């Protein structure tokens, strides 16, 4: 398991946490020094628990699929919560088995569902460590009507931070304040599957993508990414989704 405690948290301790989270994920290969995640694992190997404790020392445990870094659900005390999707119901066979209550959330874990449910787009939802504290509180004392926004903070603070060094650094920087994510962060989030696919192809294609990926940079300009010498590849993306989980 991996743990993070928000009380006494610093930029350093968050980075340590995100490192351990990455180390928790199994990989057979590295392509261009980036961990390539596994395609398939049996149930007993497939899930990792991360425990997150807020300033008030209230703890939730979150189940992630180690092949795609997707959050499957979480536990708060004696109640488990799972997303309403097929991979989450599979997860429910393996994690949080001793929970007395299990609730299935009214939506899957994808952003378009969550943003609709929250009634807020990602760019308008504060991130930063105080934001993560608030999300943990909201999920611990589950209120249906706040859960979706809190789940989006949780996902971005764990899974998305794991996938990209830039997102890790941007969230970790905000210890005592919060911030709205730029479109650079949103486009990295949007483009993980595509980047992963093209990087795997590039390794067979002299470092060249078969199909470009358009990202938005920190100056807000659309940039076209076509090979592994681009900065997003050399210095940013930290995990590769296996092409077999692309469909």
Curated annotation (Swiss-Prot):
Protein name listed in UniProt: Ribosome-inactivating protein alpha-trichosanthin
Primary role: Inactivates eukaryotic 60S ribosomal subunits.
Entry-linked Pfam families: RIP
GO biological process, alphabetically ordered: defense response; negative regulation of translation; regulation of defense response to virus
EC class: hydrolase
Further details from the record: Abortion-inducing protein. Inhibits HIV-1 infection and replication.
One function term, GO molecular function aspect: toxin activity
Reaction(s) this enzyme catalyzes, per UniProt: Endohydrolysis of the N-glycosidic bond at one specific adenosine on the 28S rRNA
Keywords: Antiviral protein, Hydrolase, Plant defense, Protein synthesis inhibitor, Signal, Toxin
Active site: 160
SUPFAM superfamilies on file: Ribosome inactivating proteins (RIP) (SSF56371)
UniProt keyword annotation of Nucleus present: no
EC number of the protein: 3.2.2.22
Family as reported in the entry's similarity comment: Belongs to the ribosome-inactivating protein family. Type 1 RIP subfamily.
Highest classification ranks of the organism: Eukaryota, Viridiplantae, Streptophyta, Embryophyta, Tracheophyta
Keyword hit for Signal: yes
């Amino acid at each position: 398991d991996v743990s993070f405690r928000l009380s006494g948290a610093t930029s350093s301790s968050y980075g340590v946490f995100i490192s351990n989270l990455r180390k928790a994920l199994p990989n057979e290969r590295k392509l261009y020094d980036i961990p390539l995640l596994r395609s398939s694992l049996p149930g007993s190997q497939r899930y990792a628990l991360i425990h997150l404790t807020n300033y008030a020392d209230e703890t939730i445990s979150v189940a992630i699929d180690v092949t795609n870094v997707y959050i499957m659900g979480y536990r708060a005390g004696d109640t488990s919560y799972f997303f309403n999707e097929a991979s989450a119901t599979e997860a429910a066979k393996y994690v949080f088995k001793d929970a007395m209550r299990k609730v299935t959330l009214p939506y899957s874990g994808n952003y378009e569902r969550l943003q609709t449910a929250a009634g807020k787009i990602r760019e308008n939802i504060p991130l930063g460590l105080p934001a993560l504290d608030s999300a943990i509180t909201t999920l611990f004392y589950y209120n249906a009507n706040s859960a979706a926004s809190a789940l989006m903070v949780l996902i971005q603070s764990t899974s998305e931070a794991a996938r990209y060094k830039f997102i890790e650094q941007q969230i970790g920087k905000r210890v005592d304040k919060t911030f709205l994510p730029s479109l650079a962060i949103i486009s990295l989030e949007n483009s993980w599957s595509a980047l992963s696919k093209q990087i795997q192809i590039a390794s067979t294609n002299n470092g060249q993508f078969e199909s470009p990926v358009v990202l938005i940079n920190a100056q807000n300009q659309r940039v076209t990414i076509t090979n592994v010498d681009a900065g997003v590849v050399t210095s940013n993306i930290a995990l590769l989704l296996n092409r077999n989980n692309m469909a």
